[PDB]
Enzyme design. Structure first.
Site, PDB file in Angstrom:
ATOM      1  N   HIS A 176       0.801  -1.227  -0.146  1.00  0.00           N
ATOM      2  CA  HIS A 176      -0.038  -0.083  -0.020  1.00  0.00           C
ATOM      3  C   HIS A 176       0.942   1.117  -0.073  1.00  0.00           C
ATOM      4  O   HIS A 176       1.371   1.576   1.108  1.00  0.00           O
ATOM      5  CB  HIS A 176      -0.989   0.077   1.063  1.00  0.00           C
ATOM      6  CG  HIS A 176      -2.060   0.876   0.956  1.00  0.00           C
ATOM      7  ND1 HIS A 176      -2.091   2.095   0.184  1.00  0.00           N
ATOM      8  CD2 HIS A 176      -3.248   1.261   2.018  1.00  0.00           C
ATOM      9  CE1 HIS A 176      -3.084   2.953   0.538  1.00  0.00           C
ATOM     10  NE2 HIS A 176      -3.805   2.393   1.437  1.00  0.00           N
ATOM     11  N   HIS A 179      -2.657   6.958  -1.285  1.00  0.00           N
ATOM     12  CA  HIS A 179      -3.591   7.687  -0.396  1.00  0.00           C
ATOM     13  C   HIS A 179      -2.878   8.481   0.896  1.00  0.00           C
ATOM     14  O   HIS A 179      -3.542   8.806   1.777  1.00  0.00           O
ATOM     15  CB  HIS A 179      -4.699   6.586  -0.052  1.00  0.00           C
ATOM     16  CG  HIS A 179      -5.159   5.822  -0.933  1.00  0.00           C
ATOM     17  ND1 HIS A 179      -5.634   4.263  -0.703  1.00  0.00           N
ATOM     18  CD2 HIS A 179      -5.607   5.844  -2.457  1.00  0.00           C
ATOM     19  CE1 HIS A 179      -6.151   4.004  -1.905  1.00  0.00           C
ATOM     20  NE2 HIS A 179      -6.199   5.075  -2.616  1.00  0.00           N
ATOM     21  N   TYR A 181      -0.311   7.707   2.763  1.00  0.00           N
ATOM     22  CA  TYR A 181       0.221   6.999   3.840  1.00  0.00           C
ATOM     23  C   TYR A 181       1.809   7.048   3.941  1.00  0.00           C
ATOM     24  O   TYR A 181       2.087   7.855   3.160  1.00  0.00           O
ATOM     25  CB  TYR A 181      -0.453   5.924   4.170  1.00  0.00           C
ATOM     26  CG  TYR A 181      -1.973   5.882   4.297  1.00  0.00           C
ATOM     27  CD1 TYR A 181      -2.467   6.388   5.412  1.00  0.00           C
ATOM     28  CD2 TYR A 181      -2.760   5.271   3.249  1.00  0.00           C
ATOM     29  CE1 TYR A 181      -3.737   6.414   5.616  1.00  0.00           C
ATOM     30  CE2 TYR A 181      -4.227   5.491   3.511  1.00  0.00           C
ATOM     31  CZ  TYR A 181      -4.599   6.084   4.722  1.00  0.00           C
ATOM     32  OH  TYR A 181      -6.104   6.274   4.948  1.00  0.00           O
TER      33      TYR A 181
HETATM   34  C1  LIG Z   1     -14.583   2.347   3.662  1.00  0.00           C
HETATM   35  C2  LIG Z   1     -13.443   2.433   2.515  1.00  0.00           C
HETATM   36  C3  LIG Z   1     -12.111   1.800   2.849  1.00  0.00           C
HETATM   37  C4  LIG Z   1     -11.021   1.772   2.219  1.00  0.00           C
HETATM   38  N1  LIG Z   1     -10.023   1.106   2.574  1.00  0.00           N
HETATM   39  C5  LIG Z   1      -8.882   1.120   1.893  1.00  0.00           C
HETATM   40  C6  LIG Z   1      -7.759   0.661   2.256  1.00  0.00           C
HETATM   41  O1  LIG Z   1      -7.508  -0.006   3.404  1.00  0.00           O
HETATM   42  N2  LIG Z   1      -6.590   0.539   1.282  1.00  0.00           N
HETATM   43  C7  LIG Z   1      -6.514   1.080   0.310  1.00  0.00           C
HETATM   44  O2  LIG Z   1      -5.731   1.108  -0.660  1.00  0.00           O
HETATM   45  N3  LIG Z   1      -7.717   1.700  -0.376  1.00  0.00           N
HETATM   46  C8  LIG Z   1      -8.944   1.730   0.634  1.00  0.00           C
HETATM   47  N4  LIG Z   1      -9.883   2.317   0.150  1.00  0.00           N
HETATM   48  C9  LIG Z   1      -9.864   2.812  -1.318  1.00  0.00           C
HETATM   49  C10 LIG Z   1     -10.623   2.072  -2.276  1.00  0.00           C
HETATM   50  O3  LIG Z   1      -9.977   0.980  -2.669  1.00  0.00           O
HETATM   51  C11 LIG Z   1     -11.664   2.718  -3.205  1.00  0.00           C
HETATM   52  O4  LIG Z   1     -12.940   2.637  -3.065  1.00  0.00           O
HETATM   53  C12 LIG Z   1     -11.122   2.208  -4.762  1.00  0.00           C
HETATM   54  O5  LIG Z   1      -9.862   2.648  -4.913  1.00  0.00           O
HETATM   55  C13 LIG Z   1     -11.991   2.731  -5.655  1.00  0.00           C
HETATM   56  O6  LIG Z   1     -13.459   3.435  -4.918  1.00  0.00           O
HETATM   57  P1  LIG Z   1     -14.944   3.029  -5.687  1.00  0.00           P
HETATM   58  O7  LIG Z   1     -14.532   1.537  -6.717  1.00  0.00           O
HETATM   59  O8  LIG Z   1     -15.475   2.989  -4.577  1.00  0.00           O
HETATM   60  O9  LIG Z   1     -15.297   4.052  -6.505  1.00  0.00           O
HETATM   61  C14 LIG Z   1     -11.061   2.281   0.863  1.00  0.00           C
HETATM   62  C15 LIG Z   1     -12.498   2.969   0.392  1.00  0.00           C
HETATM   63  C16 LIG Z   1     -13.358   2.954   1.199  1.00  0.00           C
HETATM   64  C17 LIG Z   1     -14.739   3.497   1.045  1.00  0.00           C
END
Ligand SMILES: Cc1cc2nc3c(=O)[nH]c(=O)nc-3n(C[C@H](O)[C@H](O)[C@H](O)COP(=O)(O)O)c2cc1C
Ligand SMILES: NC(=O)[C@H]1C=CCN([C@@H]2O[C@H](COP(=O)(O)OP(=O)(O)OC[C@H]3O[C@H](n4cnc5c(N)ncnc54)[C@H](O)[C@H]3O)[C@@H](O)[C@H]2O)C1
Length: 362
Positions: A176, A179, A181
């Protein structure tokens, strides 16, 4: 429907291209994977489908959310194995996302209330607020800039957690680095103000994610290592002056790692924000530059995912919020069935059923 043409993700034969994106749900009470996690991932697993677990702690100092699962202790590995066995019983491939939040933490989440670690001492500005264990929102504190020796220690934490996931039966791991981090804190020049060999040029800012990838690649193998980045997403004040140059720089290092290791990585995972053509050309440039499997993410639908595979923009498509409320999302995309709405209020709650496993099937 090209989304249901098989794909060869290295040694993993996938039957379709709908991927479960990693999503922190905060149901792993006290950082221990729970039985509710096994039911949650089982509902969404399919024969030949690919799943990526929520962000998983690599060390006691890597958490910035409540009740996120870990994989740095043996009890966590033992509890993770029961979930992996259940997912593997349905015929799905599952990767564990290794997650370090860096400066995106708070005293309540750190051992002895210590300060979070980062590449810098800059804190996240008062715009962004961190979710508190009691449901409220707190203030991001000033992190502690780590030296290069601590950097190598965090790299070792990635390497040990990658082996632990293989011990738990995971098919592979995902780094990861998105975002905003810890890894993104070293990548984005809007955060990285370091004057040593880990800051400044694109090469120095790419040193941390490079060393992290080689460490886990040499430990478990390149074909079981995925990498996720988001150069164009400014989450938690993580902006870069040239996101395309930064992404191309990371792609260059990933290509070099695959050359020295004699094997290709599992995939490259990139999340995009939602100009649509400029964002699409950015994603296409990263895909074209990377020699290997490409997974696109960020606001993708059934129509947008079909075109991404049909036009060669990506090999796999990962869905997030839609997979939260649609356990049979792969089946709904196949039949073009109506989708269920998701409730953002129960995204990070702790109930093992409510807003977690009670989303109805077709
Ligand atoms: C509740 C929630 C938790 C998420 N947790 C993570 C995570 O732990 N790690 C990560 O890389 N992205 C995380 N994401 C980003 C998701 O991967 C994201 O929903 C995805 O990249 C694309 O968004 P969509 O398909 O909902 O439009 C999270 C998103 C949401 C809404
Ligand atoms: N652990 C993670 O990587 C995720 C944790 C939190 C949310 N993730 C991402 O944060 C970004 C903004 O969060 P969102 O807009 O969903 O949250 P609010 O601003 O509260 O609404 C999105 O790109 C989303 O995919 C990332």
């Amino acid at each position: 429907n090209p989304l249901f043409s098989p794909y060869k993700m290295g040694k993993f034969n996938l039957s379709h291209r709908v991927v479960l994106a990693p999503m922190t749900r905060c149901r792993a009470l006290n950082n221990i994977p729970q039985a509710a996690l096994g039911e949650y991932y089982e509902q969404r697993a399919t024969a030949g489908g690919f799943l990526i677990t929520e962000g998983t702690m690599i060390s006691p100092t890597s958490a910035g959310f409540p009740h996120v699962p870990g994989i740095f202790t043996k009890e966590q590995v033992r509890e993770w194995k029961k979930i992996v066995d259940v997912v593997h019983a349905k015929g799905a491939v599952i990767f564990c996302q290794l997650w370090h939040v860096g400066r995106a933490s708070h005293e309540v989440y750190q051992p002895a209330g210590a300060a979070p670690i980062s590449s810098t001492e800059k804190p996240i500005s008062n715009r962004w607020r961190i979710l508190m264990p009691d449901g409220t929102h707190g203030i991001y504190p000033k992190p502690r800039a780590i030296g290069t020796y601590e950097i190598s220690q965090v790299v070792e934490d990635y390497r040990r957690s990658a082996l632990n996931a293989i011990e738990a039966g995971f098919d592979g791991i995902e780094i990861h680095g998105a975002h905003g981090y810890l890894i993104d804190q070293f990548l984005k020049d809007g955060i990285n103000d370091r004057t040593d060999e880990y800051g400044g040029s694109l090469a120095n800012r790419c040193k941390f994610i490079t060393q992290v990838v080689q460490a886990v690649v040499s430990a478990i193998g390149a074909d079981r290592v995925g990498v996720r980045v988001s150069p164009a997403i400014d989450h938690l004040d993580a902006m870069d002056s040239n996101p395309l140059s930064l992404g191309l720089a990371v792609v260059e290092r990933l290509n070099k790692i695959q050359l020295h290791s004699g094997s290709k990585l599992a995939y490259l995972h990139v999340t995009q924000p939602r100009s649509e053509e400029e964002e699409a050309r950015l994603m296409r440039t990263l895909r074209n530059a990377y020699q290997g499997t490409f997974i696109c993410s960020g606001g993708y639908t059934r129509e947008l995912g079909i075109e991404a595979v049909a036009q060669g923009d990506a090999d796999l498509v990962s869905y997030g919020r839609l997979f939260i409320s649609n356990p049979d999302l792969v089946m709904r995309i196949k039949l073009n069935a109506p989708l269920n709405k998701y409730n953002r209020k129960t995204f990070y709650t702790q109930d093992p059923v409510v807003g977690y496993t009670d989303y109805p099937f077709l």
